[PDB]
Amino acid sequence: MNPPPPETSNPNKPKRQTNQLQYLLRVVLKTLWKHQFAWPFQQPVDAVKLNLPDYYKIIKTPMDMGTIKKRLENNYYWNAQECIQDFNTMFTNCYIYNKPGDDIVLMAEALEKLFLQKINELPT
Ligand SMILES: CCN(CC)S(=O)(=O)c1ccc(O)c(NC(=O)c2[nH]c(C)c(C(C)=O)c2C)c1
């Protein structure tokens, strides 16, 4: 069945507000969230509902934009690179589990390109 979703808070970790973190939420995440192809990435893969019994056998480091959004809202991330890493993991999982030309792969590609375009303008 499904694992618990990734942690979206850490009570043991100090919190900070930064221009980069705020940009990641309000510009980067927000723009990807609203793309027509965002929906498969807005929540963890529900392998039970979707009947994908091997998904969590193959994908041991799941990640999704719903988790990333909550992490940003919760100040889970101290370093902006942590957030960027989570995006990378999310896209990479898609390329691990699926095949060239699958709908989901084409959707990930479009989102990843948009991600690159938005991160390009990450503030210093
Ligand atoms: C419409 C309502 N849903 C979304 C809110 S849904 O019912 O959960 C729903 C219905 C049908 C679906 O095909 C999905 N698919 C996915 O989400 C999804 N995402 C990723 C990253 C993958 C893989 C395998 O990489 C898959 C299969 C989700």
Swiss-Prot record:
Family, as annotated: Belongs to the BET family.
What disease is associated with this protein?
Cornelia de Lange syndrome 6: A form of Cornelia de Lange syndrome, a clinically heterogeneous developmental disorder associated with malformations affecting multiple systems. It is characterized by facial dysmorphisms, abnormal hands and feet, growth delay, cognitive retardation, hirsutism, gastroesophageal dysfunction and cardiac, ophthalmologic and genitourinary anomalies. CDLS6 inheritance is autosomal dominant.
Which residues bear the site annotation Acetylated histone binding? N98
First-to-last residue of the parent protein present? 43 to 166 of 1362
Q: What is this protein called?
A: Bromodomain-containing protein 4
Q: What does this protein do?
A: Chromatin reader protein that recognizes and binds acetylated histones and plays a key role in transmission of epigenetic memory across cell divisions and transcription regulation. Remains associated with acetylated chromatin throughout the entire cell cycle and provides epigenetic memory for postmitotic G1 gene transcription by preserving acetylated chromatin status and maintaining high-order chromatin structure. During interphase, plays a key role in regulating the transcription of signal-inducible genes by associating with the P-TEFb complex and recruiting it to promoters.
Q: How is it modified after translation?
A: Phosphorylation by CK2 disrupt the intramolecular binding between the bromo domain 2 and the NPS region and promotes binding between the NPS and the BID regions, leading to activate the protein and promote binding to acetylated histones. In absence of phosphorylation, BRD4 does not localize to p53/TP53 target gene promoters, phosphorylation promoting recruitment to p53/TP53 target promoters.
Instruction: Give the recorded effect for N98A.
Output: Abolishes binding to acetylated histones
Q: How does it assemble?
A: Interacts with p53/TP53; the interaction is direct. Interacts (via CTD region) with CDK9 and CCNT1, acting as an associated component of P-TEFb complex. Interacts with RELA (when acetylated at 'Lys-310'). Interacts (via NET domain) with NSD3, CHD4, BICRA and ATAD5. The interaction with BICRA bridges BRD4 to the GBAF complex. Interacts (via NET domain) with JMJD6 (via JmjC and N-terminal domains); the interaction is stronger in presence of ssRNA and recruits JMJD6 on distal enhancers. Interacts with NSD3. Interacts with NIPBL.
Enter cross-link residues for Glycyl lysine isopeptide (Lys-Gly) (interchain with G-Cter in SUMO2): K57
For this protein, the parts annotated as crossing the membrane are none
Cellular localisation:
Nucleus; Chromosome
The entry's free-text remark on domains says: The NET domain mediates interaction with a number of chromatin proteins involved in transcription regulation (NSD3, JMJD6, CHD4, GLTSCR1 and ATAD5).
| Additional facts recorded | JQ1, a thieno-triazolo-1,4-diazepine derivative, and I-BET, a benzodiazepine derivative, have been tested on tumors with success. Treatment with GSK1210151A (I-BET151, a I-BET derivative) has strong effets on mixed lineage leukemia and promotes myeloid differentiation and leukemia stem-cell depletion.
Q: Which residues form the signal peptide?
A: none
**Species name for this entry?**
Homo sapiens
Free-text tissue specificity from the UniProt record? Ubiquitously expressed.
List residues of the Bromo domain: 16-122
